[PDB]
């Protein structure tokens, strides 16, 4: 009962918009209150606008949100999981209540994390108490947290009371992060509370004036890049698409679009991969861009996005699908945890709705029933630095994903050349994982330990982390019987590590690791074994799988004279704070001169371990050559020569 008729709303509206003819007529007659009521009728009869954040047909609420709404009725407001139980902000709500001088505690109060739970409780229970108290608290927040603009010369000439508590409050109640969050969440609040008798026409005027204020404030205080900027632009598309009746709604959309389309070209390589080289942030970026494309798509603003934006998103999805395993799992490179098949099924459902004409993602969403598969098998991503060998897409495939690209950031680990192998149902070479964030600290030694190069499947010098992560793709052959990847990295000073990976007969792999340069030290070819019972053999340098028949493997390393094996303890992390022990084997060679140190490791996946072949392998050239390589292996006696020219 505190809301007013904010007549200025009619200057914010495009009254020539289809459906507001009665609003325009009544406004031109001076009957602004009847025009407000007519506007409410318009929104209550409008059906061509929606959001993917909520489905009014099936509105549910959990016990957590239920407690948040019921507490919110008592003016007990949930703001922060670190501040439990939630504070009570008084009957006369003091939005400046600050018992612990923590700016997060005060910032996150203006999130209104309990507003939408009150809407959900209102719809599921039908109890008007939630709507009455929500409308009251909404008007209350408007009247107690104004958006004022003053400078030092103006601020010094202030009264002597709540004027400077409000000016000081602007930095807490109107930080662009919470302003954008409210821009998105208040569309949900709008859908939830609109049919209520508390949603009066003049409350609608207050609502639209306040929302417009948020939009124009974000438009003048865009963030300093980071995902804060992506979310701000996305939510400006939310504001422009859910309330297209505003005169500035197109400008709010274009802006957001113009920002997002500008940043996808900054952080996504042309081959599809996102520039963090982390599967988790690739997926998260896909969802951030797809959420904006989504709320613009359902309301008929899909074509306001440039075509290159759509095709870039498509390339990102195809990237994640290519680096993923047939069980929909992702490799644990960088700081990525494992995503299982259910969540990815949901993702492919949404993106499949956004890209209907794309047959491959239509297949991955349908889980096989409908759609089609790509016309290729092994796929290369030479700009991102990810290379996928595969002989199948189904649950019987042999797949290897090799990570060897340019420098990343503080999420990319020094693991250039490492890989993950997935065979017939199980990942046989899992990454060491991330285990903990950053995140300091306890927890710090574990972080730096998992970030080590010596805990991956690559080459180290003195078991030290790589001084340079700048892989160069020398060769990529994805088709035919002999598929091969040649990549090299200047890992240390006077240290050129070249790795060649050969997918042979769509069955087995041969990894040739040639280290050249003037650097002298202990060269360590590391391999991170899976967890379980594994047959050691230090005399012939062999490891043979003793697992349940389904995913077995036999690996043998052929090195120079004097090569030694070291079975060290190591770890594998699949989930946050979750981890298990496995064996970290290192094939070490003392490089005391300038001659190259060369290895030929054969990896043969097999169902029954007793069927694992014995092998032979030898180099053909005298030493390391820059422009070519010839080796020869033997499978149970049958010869097979590998060679290429650069
Ligand atoms: Mg790792």
How far is ligand 1, taken at its centre, from the CA of residue 199, in Å? 53
Measured CA distances, 451 to 122, 570, 588 (Å): 48, 12, 21
**Alpha carbons 161 and 158: distance in angstroms, whole number:** 9
Closest CA to 530 of 639, 460, 605: 605
DSSP 304: G
What distance lies between CA 563 and its chain's CA centroid? 42
All residues at 6 or more sequence positions from 217 whose CB lies less than 8 Å from its CB, including other chains: 147, 174, 176, 179
Neighbours of ion ligand 1 (CB under 5 A): 413, 431-432
Binding residues for Mg(2+): 413, 431, 456
How far is ligand 1, taken at its centre, from the CA of residue 332, in Å? 6
How far is ligand 1, taken at its centre, from the CA of residue 457, in Å? 10
Cα first-last separation, the chain:
79
Reading phi first (left if > 0) and then psi (alpha if -120 to 50, else beta), residue 404 is in beta
Among all residues, which ones are annotated catalytic? Answer: 281
**Residues 559, 589: contact at Cβ < 8 Å?**
yes
Burial class, 538, CB count within 10 angstroms (exposed 0-12 / middle 13-18 / buried 19+): exposed
Domains, the chain:
1-375 (1.50.10.100), 376-646 (2.70.98.70)
How far is ligand 1, taken at its centre, from the CA of residue 627, in Å? 31
- Which method was it determined by? X-ray
**Residues 331, 319: contact at Cβ < 8 Å?**
no
How far is ligand 1, taken at its centre, from the CA of residue 133, in Å? 50
DSSP 161: S
Instruction: State both tokens at 248.
Output: 């500035």
| Residue 266 DSSP SS3 | helix
Q: What is the resolution of this structure in A?
A: 2.4
How far is ligand 1, taken at its centre, from the CA of residue 14, in Å? 54
Binding residues: 413, 431, 456
**Other C-beta atoms within 10 Å of 30: how many?**
9
């Amino acid at each position: 009962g505190s809301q007013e008729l904010k007549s200025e709303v009619f200057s914010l509206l495009n009254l020539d918009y289809p459906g507001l003819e009665k609003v325009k007529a009544l406004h031109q007659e001076g009957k602004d209150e009847d025009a407000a009521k007519a506007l409410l009728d318009y929104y209550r009869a409008r059906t061509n606008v929606k959001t993917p954040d909520i489905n009014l047909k099936k509105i549910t609420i959990g016990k957590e949100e239920q407690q948040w709404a019921d507490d919110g009725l008592k003016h007990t407001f949930f703001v922060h999981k670190g501040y439990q139980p939630s504070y009570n902000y008084g009957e006369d709500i003091n939005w400046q209540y600050w018992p612990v001088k923590d700016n997060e505690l005060r910032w996150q109060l203006h999130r209104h994390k309990w507003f939408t739970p009150m809407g959900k409780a209102y719809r599921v229970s039908g109890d008007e108490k939630y709507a009455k108290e929500w409308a009251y608290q909404y008007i209350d927040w408007i009247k107690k947290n104004p958006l004022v603009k003053m400078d030092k010369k103006e601020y010094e000439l202030v009264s002597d009371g709540k004027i400077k508590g409000e000016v000081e409050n602007v930095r807490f109640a109107w930080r662009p992060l919470e302003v954008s969050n409210r821009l998105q969440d208040q569309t949900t609040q709008f859908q939830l509370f609109l049919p209520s008798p508390s949603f009066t026409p003049d409350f609608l005027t207050e609502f639209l004036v306040n929302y417009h204020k948020h939009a124009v404030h974000i438009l003048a205080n865009y963030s300093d890049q980071g995902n804060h900027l992506l979310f701000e632009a996305q939510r400006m598309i939310y504001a422009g698409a859910f309330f297209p009746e505003f005169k500035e709604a197109p400008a709010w959309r274009k802006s957001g679009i113009d920002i997002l389309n500008r940043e996808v070209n900054v952080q996504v390589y042309n081959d599809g991969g996102q520039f963090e080289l982390d599967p988790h942030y690739h997926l998260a970026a896909i969802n951030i861009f797809c959420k904006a494309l989504g709320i613009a798509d359902v309301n008929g603003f899909r074509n306001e996005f440039p075509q290159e934006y759509l095709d870039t998103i498509e390339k990102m999805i195809m990237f994640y699908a290519n680096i993923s395993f047939p069980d929909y799992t992702n490799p644990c490179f960088s700081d990525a945890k494992i995503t299982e098949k259910k969540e990815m099924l949901k993702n492919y459902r949404a993106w499949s709705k956004l890209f209907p004409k794309n047959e491959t993602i239509k297949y991955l969403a349908t889980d096989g029933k409908e759609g089609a598969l790509p016309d290729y098998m092994s796929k290369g991503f030479l700009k991102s630095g990810f290379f996928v060998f595969r002989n199948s897409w189904g649950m019987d495939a042999t797949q290897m994903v090799v990570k060897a690209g340019p420098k990343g950031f503080w999420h990319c680990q020094p693991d250039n050349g490492t890989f993950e192998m997935w065979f017939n149902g199980k990942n046989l070479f899992p990454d060491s994982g991330s285990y903990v964030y950053a995140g300091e600290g306890e927890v710090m030694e574990q972080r730096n330990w998992h970030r080590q190069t010596s805990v991956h499947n690559t080459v180290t010098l003195d078991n030290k982390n790589l001084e340079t992560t700048e892989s160069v793709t020398k060769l990529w052959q994805p088709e035919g019987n002999i598929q091969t990847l040649v990549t090299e990295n200047p890992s240390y000073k006077n240290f050129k590590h070249r790795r060649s990976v050969f997918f042979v007969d769509n069955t087995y792999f041969v990894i040739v690791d040639e280290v050249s340069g003037s650097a002298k030290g202990s060269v360590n070819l590391h391999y991170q074994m899976p967890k379980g019972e594994i047959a050691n053999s230090r005399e012939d340098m062999t490891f043979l799988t003793q697992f349940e028949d389904g995913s077995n493997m036999k690996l043998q390393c052929f090195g120079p004279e004097g090569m030694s094996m070291k079975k060290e303890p190591g770890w594998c992390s699949t989930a946050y704070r979750k981890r298990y022990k496995r064996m970290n084997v290192s094939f070490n060679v003392k490089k005391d001169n300038e001659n190259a140190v060369r290895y030929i490791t054969v990896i043969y996946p097999v169902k029954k371990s007793a069927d694992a072949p014995k092998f032979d392998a030898k180099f053909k050239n005298k030493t390391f050559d820059e422009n070519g390589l010839e080796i020869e292996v033997k499978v149970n006696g049958k010869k097979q020569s590998l060679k290429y020219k650069l």
